[PDB]
Each structure stands twice: as structure tokens, then as C-alpha cells.
Curated annotation (Swiss-Prot), chain A:
Species of the source: Mus musculus (Mouse)
Feature type site, description Required for interaction with TP53BP1: 3
Alphabetical GO biological process terms: negative regulation of double-strand break repair via nonhomologous end joining
Location of this chain's protein in the cell: Nucleus
Protein family per UniProt: Belongs to the Nudix hydrolase family. TIRR subfamily.
The gene coding this protein: Nudt16l1
PANTHER family, per the entry: NUDIX T16 FAMILY MEMBER (PTHR31699), TUDOR-INTERACTING REPAIR REGULATOR PROTEIN (PTHR31699:SF6)
Primary role: Key regulator of TP53BP1 required to stabilize TP53BP1 and regulate its recruitment to chromatin. In absence of DNA damage, interacts with the tandem Tudor-like domain of TP53BP1, masking the region that binds histone H4 dimethylated at 'Lys-20' (H4K20me2), thereby preventing TP53BP1 recruitment to chromatin and maintaining TP53BP1 localization to the nucleus.
Subunit description: Homodimer. Interacts with TP53BP1 (via the Tudor-like domain); interaction is abolished following DNA damage and TP53BP1 phosphorylation by ATM. Interacts (via the cytoplasmic part) with SDC4. Interacts with TGFB1I1 and PXN.
Name of the protein described by the UniProt record: Tudor-interacting repair regulator protein
Length: 195, 191
């Protein structure tokens, strides 16, 4: 539960700033012809082995939040540019640093979301800061872990996991009761595996 | 620690056993992360529909496919020469997992990533490819240990560590250090 502050509050913090983008699309597809996918969200495997969102740190000495964000997306040259209209949230990170994390979000068409993936494999950052893109599975299979719970049990950039859960809720892509359910199962899996 | 069985013996197993074939595609990588630490090799893995990391591949019915043709059908060329190993997987059910590996140029490896976003499995069975970071940063978790902290198909995680060893891509002790670092990270995040 990271403390959310207003964008104005954030602009008055010795604090460093990060900007990340959550791109997503309604997804009519059905896995095995049976399981509704509902939505796909894009995340990235980072150079440091963690799953996060496209984006990174923004030096406000040099760039506005928006220009800084678009500089470090690592999504290639498919013509995608985020703006202030896509701004969603600012969160104070729990880190030993002092970081305020800004989240931008935009719903795309599934075709647009796919084109981003295709552009991304050619990014200047590909194989450097970004080791690949992955779609978030939002469904849960019959074994009660396949799909979203297993996915949440991967290793995340801490603020990125918080942001995913926060955005899924506030953008009404998933009932928060369902989110608690999936997270509970992820943590349980993680506990039993460590045993 | 999975029981390894010879190729000879695996292919004598009876109709009760199912066979899986997976491929570890890798390339020597001369790159330098931020100019400071050698990448050495890049290996391909993938996010699956079930939210786990694994290798490309899957089940092959030997009644209708050779192991190689069966593997290549899933991937679509890999040959017997690319075979590495056969392991009996942990139960419930009776599976022997075959591992194939091939070294590619880094350009060839990128060509695989390029073709993968257009495959019929993309967005269904496979949710995206990832490169394994084989380096470790100076905090001793960034890179490979963090990567090993993710959620794997258990057989794939074993095969990755096995293959890195036998292909002489990382020393056994370095593998052990990374896995130990991964595990400690997993412990701490939980509490």
C-alpha cells in the first residue's frame, strides 16, 4: 500500500523521479477456446532480472516528466508517444532511497498493443536495458494458480507490482476482490515453494 | 535434482511414458552492460500462458513424430546433434523431459525473437520471449540471481542450470552462488 500523492505534491519534493507506462488492451481471445483473457497488459523483463513497466528514471533538470518518460520507454519506433493526458498516479516508494514513482496508462486496441510488441523487438534498448516484453495473464486456471497468481509470484520491481495492482483496480479491469484472491494465491505458492 | 537417464534408455521406455522436448537457444554475447560487466552469453526463455517462465517446446507423441520433428513442429531446424539430455520429471505423471540446445550468432538469436512475435502461439500459449541475464551486478542480486527468483516451470529451471553447466557457460560454483542469492531474496521478500 504505497502512499499516493497528487501530481502537484510530487512537484515540490532531494527526491528522484521515475516514470513508467502501463499499456493495455481489451482482449476478446479465449485460451484453449475456453478461458476469457479479458485484458492484456505489457510488462518488461529488465536488465536486472526483474519484471517491470516500460520507463525509468527522469532527471527533471533536463526533461519534463513526459519527455523523460518517452525517452526511456524501450518500445521502439512505432510512433507511440505518451502525454500528460495519460498520467494516472504518483506514489511514494517504500525504498531506502527517496523516490516518487509516476504511472502513466493508456488503453490501446489489441492490434495497437501487438504493434508495440513488434516495434519493441527492434528497440535501441532491446538486449540492453530491456530483455523482453511479456503480456500479463489476467485469468486463473482450474488449478487455482495457472495464469495470474503464478504471474504475480515472479520477481518484480517493487513499485511496479504495486502499480500493476493499483491500476488494475482503479481502471476497473479487475474486481479488487479478485485481485486479493490472486495475490493471496501467489503469496501462498511462494511460501510453500520456500518450504 | 532430477534423475538423468540416457537417450538410449529413454527411447526404450514403454507407452506409459510421455515425452517432452524443449530447446535452449543461445548466443555468445560480446556486449558490456553499461560498458562495465560482460554479458558473455544470452539464452532465450519465455513467459507461458500459465504465468511461468520456461523453454520453447512441449509434448511429442512418438507414435506420430520423431523427437526432432516433433520439437521442430512446436518451435515452427534442430537436429539429433543438438540433443543434450533426458530427465525424469517429478511426478504426478510419467514424463521424460528431453533438452536440446543450439548456439546461434547473436544476429540469428535476434532473428528468432523477431519471428516469435509473429507466431501463431504468440498471445495464446506464449506471452513473450525473454533473454536470460547471466551477469551479476555488484549488489550481488541484480541480473542472474534476480532472474532465478522468478517463477519457473520447475523442469525448465533445472534444465537451464544443468545446461549452463554441461555447456561450460558458467562454472558450477557460480551457479550455486546465484541460486543461493535468488533463494535468500525470495525469503526476504516474503516476510
Amino acid at each position: 500500500e504505497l502512499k499516493q500523492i497528487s501530481r502537484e505534491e510530487a512537484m515540490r519534493l532531494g527526491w528522484s523521479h521515475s516514470c513508467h507506462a502501463m499499456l493495455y488492451a481489451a482482449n476478446p481471445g479465449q485460451l484453449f477456446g475456453r478461458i476469457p483473457m479479458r485484458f492484456s497488459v505489457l510488462m518488461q523483463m529488465r536488465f536486472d532480472g526483474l519484471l517491470g513497466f516500460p520507463g525509468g528514471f527522469v532527471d527533471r533538470r533536463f526533461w519534463s516528466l513526459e519527455d523523460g518518460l518517452n525517452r526511456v520507454l524501450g518500445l521502439g519506433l512505432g510512433g507511440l508517444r505518451l502525454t500528460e493526458a495519460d498520467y494516472l498516479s504518483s506514489h511514494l516508494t517504500e525504498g531506502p532511497h527517496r523516490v516518487v514513482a509516476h504511472l502513466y496508462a493508456r488503453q490501446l486496441t489489441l492490434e495497437q498493443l501487438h504493434a508495440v510488441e513488434i516495434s519493441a523487438v527492434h528497440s535501441r534498448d532491446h538486449g540492453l536495458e530491456v530483455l523482453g516484453l511479456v503480456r500479463v495473464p489476467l485469468y486463473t486456471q482450474k488449478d487455482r494458480v495457472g495464469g495470474f497468481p503464478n504471474f504475480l509470484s515472479n520477481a518484480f520491481v517493487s513499485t511496479a507490482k504495486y502499480q500493476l495492482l493499483f491500476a488494475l483496480k482503479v481502471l476497473n479491469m479487475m474486481p479488487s476482490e479478485k485481485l486479493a484472491e490472486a495475490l493471496a494465491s501467489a503469496t501462498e505458492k511462494q511460501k510453500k515453494a520456500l518450504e
